[model samples]
Target: MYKKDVIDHFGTQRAVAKALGISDAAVSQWKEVIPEKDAYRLEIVTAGALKYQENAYRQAA
Candidate 1:
């Protein structure tokens, strides 16, 4: 799916890929739009939290 969103929420493309149980090689050359199906998954994992917001709130708890 989208790589920027991946990094925003998880801190790295490798992080999201690891959570999804996918391989890094699958995303190494990604340079285009993320498909609709995969976008849905991104929405699930990240839950639309802004960059660093989730991490900040979690640490505050």
Candidate 2:
């Protein structure tokens, strides 16, 4: 999903960063969509509430 979606789900950038054990600055570096690696982690963290679209990269190609 998109970065905004993730931020919205977690309530704030800092919250998301904290959940992922990362810095807010690192989260800020994401562009439109969440990076694939992080997205996968979030899927588990959110218990599938925020599903990671496996086809995203393939569709982009």
Candidate 3:
């Protein structure tokens, strides 16, 4: 259901996993366990990370 959602979570599943101290795969399956609000949190965190990454990339360029 939340394909991109999962990826967006924590800027990337890898980041979210790290923050939660779990694996990216666990975050993937979170949809089955975590509710909508939690999922939203994941996305928000990801957004921040993604923004940071984007800025980093820009600076690198």
Candidate 4:
């Protein structure tokens, strides 16, 4: 999912960072597209609500 979408899903940047145990500043640094590692963790954290695009990164590369 995109960073904005994820942030919206969780209600805020802080909420997303808290769920992943990271700093809000870290979340603020993310690009429009979320990194693969973070995306996978979010998939689990959201219990499948934010579906991971399996080839999103690969296709981007």
Of the candidates numbered 1 and 4, which has the greater lDDT value?
4
Each model's RMSD to truth, in Å? 11.0, 2.0, 11.8, 2.0
Better of 2 and 4 by lDDT: 4
Which candidate gets the maximum TM-score versus the true structure? 4
Instruction: Put down candidate 4 lDDT per residue, 1-61, tens digits, no spaces.
Output: 7998898889888888888888899889999888788888888888789878776678654
Candidate 3 collision pairs: 10-46, 11-46
Least accurate stretch of 10 residues (summed lDDT) in model 2?
A: 52-61
Give candidate 1's error at residue 43 in angstroms: 0.4
Which portions of model 3 miss their true places by more than 4 Å?
1-9, 32-61
Better model by lDDT: candidate 3 vs candidate 4 = 4
- Please, what are the lDDT tens digits per residue for candidate 2 over residues 25-61? 9889988878778788888777788867777645653
After superposing candidate 1, which stretches have Cα over 4 Å from the reference? 50-61
TM-score of 1: 0.53
Which ranges in model 4 have alpha carbons more than 4 Å from their true place? Answer: 59-61
Local accuracy of candidate 3 as per-residue lDDT tens digits, 1-61: 2446455444677776676466777777664334344444444555543222222123343
Cα deviation at 36, candidate 2, in Å, is 0.9
lDDT measured at residue 9 in model 2 versus the true structure, 0 to 100: 84
Tens-place lDDT digits, model 1, residues 1-61: 4466566668777776676567776555455544444455566667654232232123343
